[PDB]
Design a protein around this ligand. Structure first.
Ligand SMILES: Nc1nc(O)c2nc(CNc3ccc(C(=O)O)cc3)cnc2n1
Ligand SMILES: Nc1nc(O)c2nc(CNc3ccc(C(=O)O)cc3)cnc2n1
Lengths: 270, 270
């Protein structure tokens, strides 16, 4: 059984407000991609629009203005790099694929932009379909309750896979993500239940993709801030791999790679 | 489902027994004990004789000269702390129990000293019986092979539990440890198989105790040295808890506690 593919998060978020222009943010992104690769990332995932807590929506033009220089610079300086883009906007995905990205990660599962499925279908790229409790990726993180969150998410992902296939994406280019954290509920129990039952989602026939990545459900009893959730991220990501994850999305490539290697080894027979 | 109990390692083997100082400074050990407690250790485990790579045997007299001052200082400045002692020697355990230790951790599983079982039986302390491929804790770490390491270790622990009980120790005071790292084999695959099948040991009726703690089986494909094994230790300890460990022994108390809390949460039913 194979190693997990580590997806290193590269957020392009211009919020410094100083004398330097867009080039400073682009240069920051390139140094960060080099570091992620140094730490053993298999894939560099570029995102121009945060969907974390308290985030809001940007225009497609602003999102392209952020990620296009970055993709260009990484492709030229690091041509071996495997590039993914985190976007739910068809116009953003189309340009990113033309510039050499090979993976599109859609937190809306193709629901925010009905044209995105066709953009990926006409390419050679893979698509990540993630479960979210609402169609809008920037909905507030309410305390959503579930009678059976595993069944709810499973039925959702089955439906979205069938829609992606009807739009022309073959099953072997579809990757599935249960969602975690606020995407599921501000109540952490449901994220833990998806992690406990993650192997069930292998019956949909698709590779699995997870992003524990210091999310709110890892706050624990101490209600840890983001900066203190690295131990919890390592544990959650290792257990996800133990239960079938093929991709792990993370800010902390070195540590999460090494932790998930242990999970992979525990999964091996003699 | 209860939290794991975190056993914080306080090893007071001196830097260089023969070349430098004969003992550690007692106040520095107390400082470390206070940090382990403040990081969330439930138990402080004092040991005067190390058993990792290349360790040296020491006499019972010298072992007492190491741990007695440190136990006395901790019981005076931290009387609420739970004390365990890591020793395979009956005369060390006897004095440790007199001074208030409530758990004896024996890496020989009661084999190295025929009197140890009886000393523990005449106390109210718990005893940890760990599997090792050889009785002598300082045996070199050979590449021991197994046809079925789970079966071998299971039958060993069943036999040591029966021996402890024959010596008057009740089953509800017996704690079992599969061993990890060189205690099992210099081949890491056998330590991963024990972790993968740890739930098989719940048939024995005893709480389970594990010490991933930056051991050699966490070296991975990079053949990481001790300093780089914290992520793997978090992942292995978390997975051990997910698979039924009741105690986790570590010197990285803060991080391993937080990671293991995630494993406990994933184990909880809706
Ligand atoms: N495929 C996939 N899977 C994710 O889990 C994901 N998460 C984020 C970032 N969004 C969040 C959402 C919630 C939280 C919190 O509750 O803390 C944090 C970050 C962005 N892209 C993502 N893509
Ligand atoms: N109950 C229990 N369980 C242990 O696992 C343990 N380990 C050590 C320390 N000994 C070792 C042995 C092997 C290795 C390596 O291969 O790296 C490292 C340290 C000391 N007390 C212990 N007690």
């Amino acid at each position: 059984m194979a190693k997990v593919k580590i997806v290193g998060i590269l957020n392009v978020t211009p919020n410094s407000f100083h004398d330097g222009g867009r080039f400073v943010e682009t240069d920051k992104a390139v140094v960060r991609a080099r570091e992620l690769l140094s730490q053993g990332a298999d894939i560099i995932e570029i995102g121009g629009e945060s969907t974390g807590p308290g985030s809001n929506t940007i225009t497609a033009d602003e999102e392209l203005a952020r990620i296009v220089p970055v993709i260009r610079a990484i492709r030229s300086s690091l041509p071996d790099a495997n590039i993914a883009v985190d976007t739910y906007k068809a116009e953003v995905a189309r340009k990113a694929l033309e510039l050499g990205a090979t993976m599109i990660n859609d937190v809306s599962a193709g629901r925010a932009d009905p044209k995105l499925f066709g953009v990926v279908a006409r390419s050679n790229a893979q698509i990540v379909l993630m479960y979210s409790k609402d169609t809008d990726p920037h909905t507030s993180f309410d305390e959503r309750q579930y009678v059976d969150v595993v069944r709810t998410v499973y039925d959702f992902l089955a439906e979205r896979k069938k829609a992606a296939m009807s739009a022309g994406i073959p099953a072997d280019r579809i990757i599935l993500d249960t969602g975690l954290g606020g995407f599921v509920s501000s109540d952490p129990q449901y994220s833990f239940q998806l992690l406990a039952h993650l192997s069930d989602f292998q019956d949909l026939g698709c590779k699995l993709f997870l992003s524990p990545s210091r999310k709110s459900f890892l706050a624990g009893n101490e209600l840890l801030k983001t900066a203190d959730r690295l131990p919890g991220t390592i544990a959650a990501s290792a257990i996800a791999v133990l239960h079938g994850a093929d991709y792990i999305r993370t800010h902390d490539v070195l540590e999460v790679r090494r932790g998930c290697e242990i999970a992979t080894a525990i999964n091996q027979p003699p």
